[PDB]
Coordinates of C-alpha atoms and ligand atoms in Angstrom, one line a residue:
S22 CA 6.1 18.5 2.3
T23 CA 6.7 16.2 -0.7
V24 CA 8.2 12.6 -0.5
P25 CA 11.5 12.7 -2.7
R26 CA 11.7 10.8 -5.9
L27 CA 15.0 9.0 -6.7
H28 CA 16.2 7.1 -9.8
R29 CA 17.5 3.7 -9.0
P30 CA 19.6 4.9 -5.8
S31 CA 22.4 2.5 -4.9
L32 CA 21.9 0.2 -2.0
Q33 CA 24.4 2.0 0.2
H34 CA 22.6 5.6 -0.6
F35 CA 19.3 3.9 0.3
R36 CA 20.5 2.3 3.4
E37 CA 22.3 5.3 4.8
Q38 CA 19.9 8.3 3.8
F39 CA 16.6 6.4 3.9
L40 CA 16.4 2.9 5.5
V41 CA 18.5 3.6 8.7
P42 CA 17.1 7.0 9.4
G43 CA 13.5 5.9 8.6
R44 CA 12.8 8.5 5.9
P45 CA 10.3 7.9 3.1
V46 CA 11.1 7.9 -0.6
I47 CA 9.6 7.1 -3.9
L48 CA 12.0 4.8 -5.8
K49 CA 11.8 5.4 -9.8
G50 CA 13.2 3.0 -12.4
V51 CA 13.2 0.0 -10.3
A52 CA 9.7 -1.7 -11.1
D53 CA 8.7 0.2 -13.9
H54 CA 9.6 -2.5 -16.3
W55 CA 8.3 -5.5 -14.4
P56 CA 5.7 -7.4 -16.3
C57 CA 2.8 -6.5 -14.3
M58 CA 3.2 -2.9 -15.4
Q59 CA 2.1 -3.9 -19.0
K60 CA 0.3 -7.2 -18.4
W61 CA -2.2 -6.6 -15.6
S62 CA -5.4 -5.4 -17.5
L63 CA -8.6 -6.3 -15.9
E64 CA -9.0 -9.0 -18.6
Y65 CA -5.7 -10.3 -17.8
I66 CA -6.6 -10.6 -14.0
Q67 CA -10.0 -12.4 -14.9
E68 CA -8.2 -14.8 -17.1
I69 CA -5.5 -15.9 -14.7
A70 CA -7.5 -15.3 -11.3
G71 CA -11.4 -14.9 -12.1
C72 CA -12.3 -18.3 -10.6
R73 CA -10.4 -17.9 -7.4
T74 CA -11.8 -17.0 -3.9
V75 CA -10.6 -13.7 -2.5
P76 CA -11.6 -11.9 0.8
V77 CA -13.2 -8.4 0.1
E78 CA -13.6 -5.6 2.4
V79 CA -17.1 -4.0 1.9
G80 CA -17.9 -0.5 3.4
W88 CA -17.7 -2.4 7.3
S89 CA -17.9 -6.2 6.8
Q90 CA -15.4 -8.8 5.4
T91 CA -16.8 -11.3 2.7
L92 CA -15.7 -13.9 0.3
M93 CA -16.2 -14.1 -3.6
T94 CA -14.5 -15.0 -6.8
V95 CA -12.3 -12.3 -8.5
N96 CA -14.6 -12.5 -11.4
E97 CA -17.7 -11.6 -8.8
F98 CA -15.5 -8.8 -7.3
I99 CA -14.7 -7.2 -10.5
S100 CA -18.6 -7.5 -11.7
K101 CA -20.0 -6.1 -8.3
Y102 CA -17.5 -3.4 -7.2
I103 CA -15.4 -2.3 -10.4
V104 CA -17.5 -2.4 -13.6
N105 CA -21.3 -2.3 -12.9
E106 CA -21.9 1.2 -11.2
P107 CA -21.0 -0.3 -7.8
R108 CA -23.5 0.2 -4.9
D109 CA -21.0 -0.2 -2.3
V110 CA -17.1 0.2 -2.0
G111 CA -15.3 -3.0 -2.2
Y112 CA -11.6 -3.6 -1.7
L113 CA -9.5 -6.7 -2.4
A114 CA -7.2 -5.7 0.4
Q115 CA -4.3 -7.1 2.1
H116 CA -4.3 -10.5 0.5
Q117 CA -1.3 -12.9 -0.5
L118 CA -2.7 -13.3 -3.9
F119 CA 0.7 -14.3 -5.1
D120 CA 1.1 -17.3 -2.9
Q121 CA -2.6 -18.3 -4.0
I122 CA -1.7 -17.9 -7.6
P123 CA 2.0 -18.5 -8.3
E124 CA 1.7 -17.7 -12.0
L125 CA 1.0 -14.1 -11.0
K126 CA 4.2 -13.9 -9.0
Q127 CA 5.9 -14.3 -12.2
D128 CA 5.2 -10.8 -13.2
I129 CA 6.7 -9.1 -9.9
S130 CA 10.1 -9.2 -8.4
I131 CA 11.4 -8.7 -4.7
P132 CA 13.0 -5.5 -4.6
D133 CA 16.8 -5.8 -4.4
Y134 CA 16.8 -3.1 -1.4
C135 CA 14.9 -5.9 0.6
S136 CA 18.4 -7.6 1.1
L137 CA 19.5 -4.8 3.3
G138 CA 17.1 -6.1 5.9
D139 CA 17.7 -8.6 8.6
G140 CA 14.9 -10.9 7.7
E141 CA 14.9 -14.0 5.5
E142 CA 13.6 -13.4 1.8
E143 CA 11.1 -16.5 2.5
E144 CA 9.5 -14.3 5.3
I145 CA 8.6 -11.4 3.3
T146 CA 4.7 -10.8 3.0
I147 CA 3.5 -9.9 -0.5
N148 CA 0.1 -8.5 -0.6
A149 CA -2.2 -7.3 -3.4
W150 CA -4.4 -4.3 -2.9
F151 CA -7.2 -4.3 -5.8
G152 CA -10.0 -1.9 -6.0
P153 CA -11.8 0.8 -7.6
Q154 CA -11.5 4.7 -7.2
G155 CA -12.2 5.8 -3.8
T156 CA -11.1 2.9 -1.4
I157 CA -9.6 4.8 1.7
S158 CA -7.3 3.0 4.1
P159 CA -7.4 5.0 7.5
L160 CA -4.2 6.3 8.8
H161 CA -2.2 3.4 10.6
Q162 CA 1.1 2.0 11.2
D163 CA 2.7 -1.5 10.5
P164 CA 5.5 -3.4 12.3
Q165 CA 7.9 -4.0 9.4
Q166 CA 9.3 -1.9 6.5
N167 CA 7.3 -1.7 3.3
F168 CA 7.9 -1.2 -0.5
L169 CA 4.4 -0.4 -1.8
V170 CA 4.6 -0.7 -5.7
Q171 CA 1.8 0.9 -7.7
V172 CA 0.8 -0.9 -10.8
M173 CA -2.5 0.4 -11.9
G174 CA -3.9 3.8 -11.3
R175 CA -2.8 6.2 -8.6
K176 CA -3.0 6.7 -5.1
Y177 CA -3.0 9.6 -2.8
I178 CA -0.9 8.8 0.2
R179 CA -0.2 10.8 3.4
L180 CA 2.6 9.9 5.8
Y181 CA 3.3 11.0 9.6
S182 CA 6.5 10.1 11.3
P183 CA 6.3 7.8 14.4
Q184 CA 7.4 11.0 16.3
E185 CA 4.0 12.4 15.8
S186 CA 2.0 9.6 17.3
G187 CA 0.7 11.9 20.0
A188 CA -1.1 14.2 17.7
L189 CA -2.8 11.1 15.8
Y190 CA -4.8 9.8 18.8
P191 CA -4.5 6.0 18.5
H192 CA -7.3 3.9 19.5
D193 CA -7.0 2.9 23.0
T194 CA -7.9 -0.8 22.4
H195 CA -4.8 -3.2 21.8
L196 CA -6.3 -4.5 18.7
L197 CA -6.4 -1.1 17.1
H198 CA -3.7 0.6 19.0
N199 CA -1.7 1.0 15.5
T200 CA -4.7 2.9 14.0
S201 CA -5.5 6.5 14.2
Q202 CA -8.9 7.8 15.3
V203 CA -8.7 10.8 13.0
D204 CA -10.1 10.9 9.5
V205 CA -6.9 12.2 7.8
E206 CA -8.8 14.4 5.2
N207 CA -11.9 15.7 7.3
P208 CA -10.6 15.7 10.8
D209 CA -12.6 16.6 13.9
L210 CA -10.4 19.2 15.1
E211 CA -12.7 19.8 18.1
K212 CA -12.1 16.4 19.5
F213 CA -8.6 16.0 17.9
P214 CA -7.0 19.6 17.9
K215 CA -3.5 18.3 17.8
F216 CA -3.8 16.8 14.6
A217 CA -4.0 20.2 12.9
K218 CA -0.4 21.0 13.4
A219 CA 1.3 17.7 12.9
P220 CA 3.7 17.9 10.0
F221 CA 3.4 15.2 7.4
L222 CA 4.6 14.1 3.7
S223 CA 2.3 13.4 0.9
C224 CA 2.6 12.2 -2.6
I225 CA 0.5 10.9 -5.5
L226 CA 1.9 7.4 -6.3
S227 CA 1.7 6.5 -9.9
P228 CA 2.1 3.3 -11.9
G229 CA 5.7 1.9 -12.0
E230 CA 6.7 4.0 -8.8
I231 CA 7.7 2.3 -5.4
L232 CA 7.0 3.9 -2.1
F233 CA 9.2 3.1 0.8
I234 CA 7.1 3.3 3.9
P235 CA 9.7 2.9 7.0
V236 CA 8.8 0.6 9.7
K237 CA 6.0 2.2 11.9
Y238 CA 5.6 5.2 9.7
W239 CA 1.9 6.3 9.9
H240 CA 0.3 6.0 6.3
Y241 CA -3.3 6.9 4.9
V242 CA -4.1 5.7 1.4
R243 CA -6.9 6.8 -1.1
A244 CA -7.3 5.3 -4.6
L245 CA -7.8 8.1 -7.1
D246 CA -8.6 5.5 -10.0
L247 CA -9.3 2.0 -10.5
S248 CA -6.0 0.7 -8.6
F249 CA -3.9 -2.3 -8.1
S250 CA -0.8 -2.0 -5.7
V251 CA 1.5 -4.8 -4.4
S252 CA 3.2 -4.3 -1.0
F253 CA 6.5 -6.2 0.3
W254 CA 6.5 -6.1 4.1
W255 CA 10.1 -7.0 5.3
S256 CA 12.5 -6.5 7.9
Ligands
LIG301 O1 -2.8 0.4 -0.5 C1 -3.6 0.4 0.4 O2 -4.7 0.8 0.4 C2 -2.9 0.2 1.7 C3 -3.5 0.3 2.9 C4 -2.9 -0.2 4.0 N1 -1.6 -0.6 4.1 C5 -0.9 -0.7 3.0 C6 0.4 -1.0 3.1 O3 1.0 -1.4 1.9 O4 1.0 -1.5 4.2 C7 -1.7 -0.2 1.8
LIG302 MN1 -0.3 -0.6 5.8

């Protein structure tokens, strides 16, 4: 089914109907006027961050290059490979960019300290795919540039998602969500899920341990807030 969209729900409504039960929701009217939403063009990103080194996932391997190199080789110049500036604390590295975002007020409903919230950038071309996996904290995934198709499976469906047997990857599914091998993974077919297309200015709440799969539909920039 679909992820519900709510305009600026109260702290109490969000706590009682989504955070405590662990139900996903898209928050509208919250981040839509953050400065990032108008400011972050490719040219602006190059101007403020182009000379800084970032980690880039290619394919599968992990390499290092400047933001300018990343844009030239994996965004603009008919890229040969898929490259993704994924899961990087860009705002600690470049505190000027931190001025263009905010910590969602809803994070204050958590038990953790604000100083411990992890803010990650996810910047890449159309077609980046993040396989189905779960994380150990709550998340607000804020979409800034482009759209993402996102599939969500409750932790109650873990049995049908065939987690990898190793400890390192036990929080990642063996299944390719959009082309599953149903001969090897038959239980996957019947597992219920939610999905959405997350667009600029929208925030997706991903409850702690909810399984999520993410495919960029356009040139995309997202900012995640991992919090407890
Ligand atoms: O946007 C993504 O590609 C992505 C992938 C994995 N996890 C997250 C997240 O925000 O936790 C985001
Ligand atoms: Mn994640």
